[PDB]
Enzyme design. Sequence first.
Site, PDB file in Angstrom:
ATOM      1  N   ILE B  28     -54.340 -19.696  19.622  1.00  0.00           N
ATOM      2  CA  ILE B  28     -54.619 -20.523  20.793  1.00  0.00           C
ATOM      3  C   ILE B  28     -54.755 -21.991  20.401  1.00  0.00           C
ATOM      4  CG2 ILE B  28     -55.580 -18.739  22.301  1.00  0.00           C
ATOM      5  CD1 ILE B  28     -58.421 -19.990  21.387  1.00  0.00           C
ATOM      6  N   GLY B  29     -54.983 -22.229  19.122  1.00  0.00           N
ATOM      7  CA  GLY B  29     -55.176 -23.575  18.649  1.00  0.00           C
ATOM      8  C   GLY B  29     -54.950 -23.714  17.170  1.00  0.00           C
ATOM      9  N   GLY B  31     -55.561 -27.208  14.523  1.00  0.00           N
ATOM     10  CA  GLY B  31     -55.927 -28.599  14.335  1.00  0.00           C
ATOM     11  C   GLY B  31     -56.702 -28.776  13.047  1.00  0.00           C
ATOM     12  N   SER B  32     -57.542 -29.811  12.996  1.00  0.00           N
ATOM     13  CA  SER B  32     -58.431 -30.002  11.844  1.00  0.00           C
ATOM     14  C   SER B  32     -59.502 -28.893  11.777  1.00  0.00           C
ATOM     15  CB  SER B  32     -59.041 -31.412  11.815  1.00  0.00           C
ATOM     16  OG  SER B  32     -58.225 -32.307  11.050  1.00  0.00           O
ATOM     17  N   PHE B  33     -59.977 -28.456  12.949  1.00  0.00           N
ATOM     18  CA  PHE B  33     -60.848 -27.270  13.055  1.00  0.00           C
ATOM     19  C   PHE B  33     -60.209 -25.988  12.485  1.00  0.00           C
ATOM     20  CE2 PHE B  33     -59.365 -28.405  17.488  1.00  0.00           C
ATOM     21  CZ  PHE B  33     -58.411 -27.412  17.679  1.00  0.00           C
ATOM     22  N   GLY B  34     -58.919 -26.059  12.147  1.00  0.00           N
ATOM     23  CA  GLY B  34     -58.197 -24.959  11.519  1.00  0.00           C
ATOM     24  C   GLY B  34     -57.324 -24.212  12.515  1.00  0.00           C
ATOM     25  N   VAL B  36     -57.173 -21.407  15.240  1.00  0.00           N
ATOM     26  CA  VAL B  36     -58.046 -20.622  16.097  1.00  0.00           C
ATOM     27  C   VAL B  36     -57.231 -19.575  16.839  1.00  0.00           C
ATOM     28  CG1 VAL B  36     -59.765 -20.605  17.939  1.00  0.00           C
ATOM     29  CG2 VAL B  36     -59.740 -22.452  16.310  1.00  0.00           C
ATOM     30  N   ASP B 142     -69.570 -34.834  17.357  1.00  0.00           N
ATOM     31  CA  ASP B 142     -68.261 -34.898  17.981  1.00  0.00           C
ATOM     32  C   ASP B 142     -68.339 -34.298  19.361  1.00  0.00           C
ATOM     33  OD1 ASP B 142     -65.638 -35.829  18.044  1.00  0.00           O
ATOM     34  OD2 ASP B 142     -64.770 -34.142  16.993  1.00  0.00           O
TER      35      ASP B 142
HETATM   36  C1  LIG Z   1     -60.055 -22.679  25.460  1.00  0.00           C
HETATM   37  N1  LIG Z   1     -60.459 -22.588  24.063  1.00  0.00           N
HETATM   38  C2  LIG Z   1     -61.647 -22.061  23.634  1.00  0.00           C
HETATM   39  C3  LIG Z   1     -61.711 -22.122  22.254  1.00  0.00           C
HETATM   40  C4  LIG Z   1     -62.871 -21.667  21.535  1.00  0.00           C
HETATM   41  C5  LIG Z   1     -63.495 -22.132  20.420  1.00  0.00           C
HETATM   42  C6  LIG Z   1     -63.179 -23.254  19.527  1.00  0.00           C
HETATM   43  C7  LIG Z   1     -63.286 -23.150  18.129  1.00  0.00           C
HETATM   44  C8  LIG Z   1     -63.003 -24.245  17.299  1.00  0.00           C
HETATM   45  C9  LIG Z   1     -62.623 -25.468  17.855  1.00  0.00           C
HETATM   46  C10 LIG Z   1     -62.536 -25.617  19.239  1.00  0.00           C
HETATM   47  N2  LIG Z   1     -62.161 -26.839  19.720  1.00  0.00           N
HETATM   48  C11 LIG Z   1     -62.038 -27.168  21.139  1.00  0.00           C
HETATM   49  C12 LIG Z   1     -60.720 -26.559  21.633  1.00  0.00           C
HETATM   50  O1  LIG Z   1     -59.621 -27.316  21.102  1.00  0.00           O
HETATM   51  C13 LIG Z   1     -60.686 -26.561  23.159  1.00  0.00           C
HETATM   52  O2  LIG Z   1     -60.637 -27.899  23.646  1.00  0.00           O
HETATM   53  C14 LIG Z   1     -62.835 -24.509  20.063  1.00  0.00           C
HETATM   54  C15 LIG Z   1     -64.699 -21.295  20.202  1.00  0.00           C
HETATM   55  O3  LIG Z   1     -65.516 -21.420  19.280  1.00  0.00           O
HETATM   56  N3  LIG Z   1     -64.738 -20.390  21.201  1.00  0.00           N
HETATM   57  C16 LIG Z   1     -63.700 -20.539  22.041  1.00  0.00           C
HETATM   58  O4  LIG Z   1     -63.479 -19.856  23.033  1.00  0.00           O
HETATM   59  C17 LIG Z   1     -60.493 -22.754  21.829  1.00  0.00           C
HETATM   60  C18 LIG Z   1     -59.945 -23.115  20.587  1.00  0.00           C
HETATM   61  C19 LIG Z   1     -58.681 -23.711  20.546  1.00  0.00           C
HETATM   62  F1  LIG Z   1     -58.167 -24.026  19.356  1.00  0.00           F
HETATM   63  C20 LIG Z   1     -57.935 -23.974  21.691  1.00  0.00           C
HETATM   64  C21 LIG Z   1     -58.457 -23.629  22.944  1.00  0.00           C
HETATM   65  C22 LIG Z   1     -59.729 -23.027  22.985  1.00  0.00           C
END
Ligand SMILES: Cn1cc(C2=C(c3cccc(NC[C@H](O)CO)c3)C(=O)NC2=O)c2cc(F)ccc21
Lengths: 344, 344
Positions: B28-29, B31-34, B36, B142
Amino acid sequence: SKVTTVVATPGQGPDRPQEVSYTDTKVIGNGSFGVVYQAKLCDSGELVAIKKVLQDKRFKNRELQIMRKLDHCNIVRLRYFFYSSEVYLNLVLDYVPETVYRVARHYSRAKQTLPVIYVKLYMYQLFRSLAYIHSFGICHRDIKPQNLLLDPDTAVLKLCDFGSAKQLVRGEPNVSYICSRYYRAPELIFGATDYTSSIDVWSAGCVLAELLLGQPIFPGDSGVDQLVEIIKVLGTPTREQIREMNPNYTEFKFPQIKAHPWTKVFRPRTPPEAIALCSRLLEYTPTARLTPLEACAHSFFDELRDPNVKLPNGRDTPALFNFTTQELSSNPPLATILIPPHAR
Amino acid sequence: SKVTTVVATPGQGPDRPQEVSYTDTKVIGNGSFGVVYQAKLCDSGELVAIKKVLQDKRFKNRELQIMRKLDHCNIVRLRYFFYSSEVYLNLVLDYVPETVYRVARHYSRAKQTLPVIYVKLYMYQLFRSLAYIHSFGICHRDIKPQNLLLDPDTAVLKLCDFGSAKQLVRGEPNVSYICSRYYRAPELIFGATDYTSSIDVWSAGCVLAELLLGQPIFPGDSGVDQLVEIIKVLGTPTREQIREMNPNYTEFKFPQIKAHPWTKVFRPRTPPEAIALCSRLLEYTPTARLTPLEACAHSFFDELRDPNVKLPNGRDTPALFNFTTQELSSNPPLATILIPPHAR
Ligand SMILES: Cn1cc(C2=C(c3cccc(NC[C@H](O)CO)c3)C(=O)NC2=O)c2cc(F)ccc21
Ligand SMILES: Cn1cc(C2=C(c3cccc(NC[C@H](O)CO)c3)C(=O)NC2=O)c2cc(F)ccc21
């Protein structure tokens, strides 16, 4: 259409105001750079930009002071300036219709990349404008695609927005908080206050990388994310490099990350000379970065010095070799590579 | 569909790993957060997020360390963590489908503003999450709309991404280069290294302002432009305020700009209590900023304490008053405002 008539001072000549009449006045921009208008000069039909800012009571306008000094084919020229109704300073400037930002975006959304000849032309002309401003000791401090104006027919590039620009004096401190997301040298991210004009060169290396990649090389909305991307490519900075950026940061932890081979950063087709140029622009150590004049003399731009080079539309290239002594001052011997036989 | 079974440690309980089976794994993602992932837990059918990052050899994972400590209804909970293959740390997290970023954007481009009831609900719950983490001395660093996850049916908000979060210790220096464009406290723009958890509060004030305005209150791609916008609203910082942000910056020029009345920043229908809250969040002087717990007790959120308040879809509001002693520690007498009669 209103015709507006002002008494305006020519940008660089002797201080002798002229009645200047203009028309077709529309807003084209509205940001921190203030309101920017486009208009047409009644005498010549030439389109101009007019940047209007509120003029502080106490100080001199720094941008005006810098622009009055500059006259170069790759920098938007201050044609006139005048005051209008609190006092407003109005800068009458070259109008250039496109930007590297918008163009890179056209290509990016069409899933193509900007032909390398344009990368050569645009980057070369950026480096010229930088050699020129740096020779006055002026650092732009906000080099980014949006500040690179282009004419699509002539492939002329002009640097614009001197609202951040500043003459950098050794030992005199400078605010770290300049430069825009994606384009900031690591020393700025670290909060350096004693940086040099080589931050403009880092920024240009990011623009070049971006044109080759089809997206920013060091993305991130926070300095931490930006640093992660920089380290992924350059490897972890040494103890020395860190202390140079910010003496107070040597104590902080830094993941031991191996350098990514520069060739693997870019697509397979990418000219090796383009990659070599990037690596010499995007260096941690500011003094290790090429100078703008040395960037111009780099082998990546050899094609521009070929007597048979033409623009894709058939036209001749724009002016690339009309170097002045001021422009060449950082390193006059470079004039040998820079001004090729056919242009002498 | 792949069923993956791992042996994972529960986030906060006793260190007793369990076999955890999940399926429907999709990225789903990234980025720098890795990377996901989203996935589904085979036992319960619950959707989860799995954040996978490379684990350094030398250090402990700081995010993991912080997440293992936290359990709060407005923070994404670490359910499990496990290692996989170099070595990858995997955080199994609450999954929440929407973001304040995406929602503000839907309203923005429909030229509507988010109904004030949602502004109250979301901001209140953000401040709870901050009261909670700050009570451990943990600063998120952040806070931005993208890190505010939302359930559209229950109107629950959870703070996510603890990748930059850090326990802030007085006298111990912190990197200045955290926080994202638009949301950075001026002390960070100035390069402060001795900031407090109150940066998270500035950031939240920027989110509130953004939700009310339909656009960021302090836009700009460079700190320079951001400071211009901040000064346009707050007036020029006093010499003392500057010295506090960064001692080395006192000598720099600063145009004398008057404070713009906070009421005129926002549209005419904007509730006065929302404006009052903003002005108490967006203060130059860090200690002048409301604490997250004081923010929760602000009169802007009075409506949330009314026994008759309902969500627009008819449902009851989500949990808003299950305050713990840990959560209240910064100021226990606030419990009188915070926990209303019907909730005791
Ligand atoms: C909708 N959504 C929830 C996400 C969730 C995260 C999560 C974990 C790490 C980073 C971020 N960053 C914000 C994300 O990019 C949404 O703006 C979100 C979490 O811990 N629980 C979730 O449901 C998530 C992550 C993504 F990379 C992209 C979309 C995401
Ligand atoms: C296309 N274009 C040229 C602009 C020109 C400027 C100018 C003057 C001040 C600031 C900027 N900033 C960059 C701009 O936003 C383009 O991306 C550009 C100039 O000096 N000559 C021009 O033709 C310009 C300005 C705008 F506000 C918006 C679009 C502009």
